[PDB]
Amino acid sequence: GPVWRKHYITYRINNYTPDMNREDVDYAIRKAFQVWSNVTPLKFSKINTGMADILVVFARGAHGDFHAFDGKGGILAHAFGPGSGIGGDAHFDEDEFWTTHSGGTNLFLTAVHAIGHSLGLGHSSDPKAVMFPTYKYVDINTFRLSADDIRGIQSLYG
Ligand SMILES: COc1ccc(S(=O)(=O)N(Cc2cccnc2)[C@@H](C(=O)NO)C(C)C)cc1
Ligand SMILES: [Ca+2]
Ligand SMILES: [Ca+2]
Ligand SMILES: [Ca+2]
Ligand SMILES: [Zn+2]
Ligand SMILES: [Zn+2]
Ligand SMILES: [Zn+2]
Known part of the structure; x- marks a missing residue:
């Protein structure tokens, strides 16, 4: 259905898995958002105060x-x-x-x-x-959004 009307979007990590150390969790999540901001006008920002969108x-x-x-x-x-x-x-x-x-x-x-x-x-x-x-593991250096991902997200956020 609906897409974000705004182009500035906040996220908060509610709690941390004990499986990885804290800095690695932050890194993974940050890099994951970066993947999408790289191909859209969307900007993502981590908060720990107030209320996050995500x-x-x-x-x-x-x-x-x-x-x-x-x-x-x-x-x-x-x-x-x-x-x-x-x-x-x-x-x-x-x-x-x-x-x-x-x-x-x-x-x-x-x-x-x-x-x-x-x-x-x-x-x-x-x-x-x-x-x-x-789910299929790929080398996080061999990782890339496919043409279908990029096409999809850009159809939403042009
Ligand atoms: C690459 O990232 C991934 C994230 C989550 C999954 S998931 O196996 O948990 N999965 C899809 C699924 C797979 C197999 C059978 N039924 C459903 C959930 C899903 O698609 N969530 O986003 C589904 C149950 C809702 C797979 C890959
Ligand atoms: Ca666990
Ligand atoms: Ca929300
Ligand atoms: Ca499970
Ligand atoms: Zn539901
Ligand atoms: Zn849930
Ligand atoms: Zn899914």
Whole structure:
């Protein structure tokens, strides 16, 4: 449905996974937002005071919405499309083991996908798109938005 009317957008990390150290969580999330700001007029800013447009939450099982997480494996993450309140928020399953690299579920890659939803994208049919609804680890230096991702997001934020 609706897209952000404004081009200045805040995010707050509600809480931290104990799987990675704090600085690595910040880094992953920052880099994930950068991916999208790189191809749009959107500007993202992290806050810890006031109210963020996008709340980033790590939680297991039932966590206050109607989409409970399911333990280790399966559902990794979900996010809500643009809007007030819960709109834009991105939730990560704490029962996953979040990693800077290949040996669990990579936070950066998962967050790029989740944030795509937070900005209003649905799933892609293109297996090389970040919005493809299958997790597959890629070298975070071999990482790139596909043409379908870029086309998609630019159709929303021209
Ligand atoms: C690359 O980033 C990813 C983030 C999340 C997932 S996810 O497996 O958790 N996933 C898609 C899915 C996969 C398999 C079977 N049913 C649903 C959720 C999803 O698409 N959330 O955004 C779905 C259950 C809502 C996969 C990849
Ligand atoms: Ca929100
Ligand atoms: Ca899970
Ligand atoms: Ca965990
Ligand atoms: Zn719902
Ligand atoms: Zn949730
Ligand atoms: Zn998804």
